[PDB]
Amino acid sequence: QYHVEKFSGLRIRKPRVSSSEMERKMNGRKLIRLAQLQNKIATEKLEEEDWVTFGVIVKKITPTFSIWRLNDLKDLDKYISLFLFGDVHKEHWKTDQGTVIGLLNANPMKPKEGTDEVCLSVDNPQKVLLMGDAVDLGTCKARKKNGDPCTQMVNLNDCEYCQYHVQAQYKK
């Protein structure tokens, strides 16, 4: 049914970019995983690279500009916030939660008080590449102590249990 798209490592439902269009989008570019962005910025090694990263929209908020919480579904505990302003917001703000995106050459922002999460914005709506729906974006199958469903996010293709609940499945 679905293939692991090579650059993101995600199985995509209804892919919007062909394999050749991705090849030319990636040509000559540095792939940097989301989890590496903090360190790259802190050591000022980010700007000199023509770079791309991948993440899925896991949360949206639109207070006019908007923010997307991104996670790449490979390192499950690492998140960035992407801020959409102007043209980018206008073009892209209605995009579905669960969308896989390539993010290219975004600009680091001031830290958002209380969180050590990388915040980035983007010059230009062409630095956002919509790749399709993340078929394996799901919720943890375990329950909390009180019987409520766990709400932690999961990559269904790799593990059906979040970090906290595997810690306990492994001890079984």
> Counting contacts by CB under 5 A, is residue 165 touching Zn ion?
yes
Q: According to the binding rule CB under 5 A, does residue 137 interact with Zn ion? A: no
**150, 139 Cβ separation under 8 angstroms:** yes
**Alpha-carbon span 84 to 67, nearest angstrom:** 6
Piece in contact with Zn ion (CB under 5 A), picked from 8-16, 22-30, 35-43, 164-172: 164-172
The residue from 142, 156, 159, 166 that contacts Zn ion (CB under 5 A) is 142
Task: Work out whether 150 is an interface residue with Zn ion (CB under 5 A).
Answer: yes
Q: Which residues contact 118 (CB under 8 A, 6 or more apart)?
A: 34, 37, 38, 41, 80, 81, 108
From 46-54, 55-63, 93-101, 157-165, give the range in contact with Zn ion by CB under 5 A.
157-165
Q: Does 152 bind Zn ion (CB under 5 A)?
A: yes
- Find the binder of Zn ion among 35, 118, 140, 153 (CB under 5 A): 140
* Closer CB to Zn ion, 31 or 142, in the complex: 142
- Is the Cβ of residue 41 or residue 142 nearer to Zn ion in the bound state? 142
Q: In the complex, what is the shortest distance from the CB of residue 5 to Zn ion, in angstroms, rounded to a whole number?
A: 26
Q: Which residues bind Zn ion (CB under 5 A)?
A: 140, 142, 150, 152, 162, 165
